[PDB]
Design a protein around this ligand. Structure first.
Ligand SMILES: CC(C)CN(C[C@@H](O)[C@H](Cc1ccccc1)NC(=O)O[C@H]1CO[C@H]2OCC[C@H]21)S(=O)(=O)c1ccc(N)cc1
Ligand SMILES: [Cl-]
Ligand SMILES: [Cl-]
Ligand code: NA
Lengths: 99, 99
């Protein structure tokens, strides 16, 4: 698809068998999702945005469908205000910015 | 141009007579620049992201040149850790996400 930016670029994702809404975010290095259960071990990480930093849980090699495209990669879990698909998984689905 | 997302999508902008580097950020509703002077009226605003909220000055009808493309709109000025070009100006340069 070609997604314009007049509204938020929200898509459906599927993770752990559950559908969620997430933002395609070229300003995010990292995918970060709201609190949920994921399999395996996690590692600590801090991520910093406009209001400061938060602690998140880093899960690696997580299966996640994004707008119907399959990705397998790192998902951060923590008190983000919105689910965000960052560049680590945008590259897996072949996304580019065009103007 | 077509900008891949292996690295942060940074571009050169011109704003208020000044050249700056800024992030093309589809996850940002609004454009937010580090502290600088801009002419004209402003009003205070709070914007929230990961980490919480910051207080900014909202300047309307500001012209910015973004990687060679002129646009006008609202620019928020405050203690953002990174200069961010948000959707309000991305739309004006015809930026899309494609995959
Ligand atoms: C500020 C950026 C350099 C980094 N952010 C991504 C950014 O796109 C967020 C993503 C985002 C979106 C909604 C809520 C929180 C964060 N947008 C944002 O802060 O935009 C603000 C300006 O316009 C407003 O519209 C959205 C909030 C305001 S971030 O959310 O802090 C973040 C940082 C690191 C990772 N790995 C993932 C996300
Ligand atoms: Cl605007
Ligand atoms: Cl358009
Ligand atoms: Na103005």
């Amino acid at each position: 698809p070609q997604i314009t930016l007049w509204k938020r670029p929200l898509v459906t994702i599927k993770i752990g068998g559950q559908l969620k809404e997430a933002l395609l975010d070229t300003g995010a290095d990292d995918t970060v999702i709201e609190e949920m259960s994921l399999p395996g071990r996690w590692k600590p990480k801090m991520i910093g945005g406009v209001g400061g930093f938060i602690k998140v849980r880093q899960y690696d090699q997580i299966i996640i469908e994004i707008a119907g495209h399959k990705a397998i990669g790192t998902v951060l879990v923590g008190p983000t205000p919105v689910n965000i698909i960052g560049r680590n998984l945008l590259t897996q689905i072949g996304a580019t910015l065009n103007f």
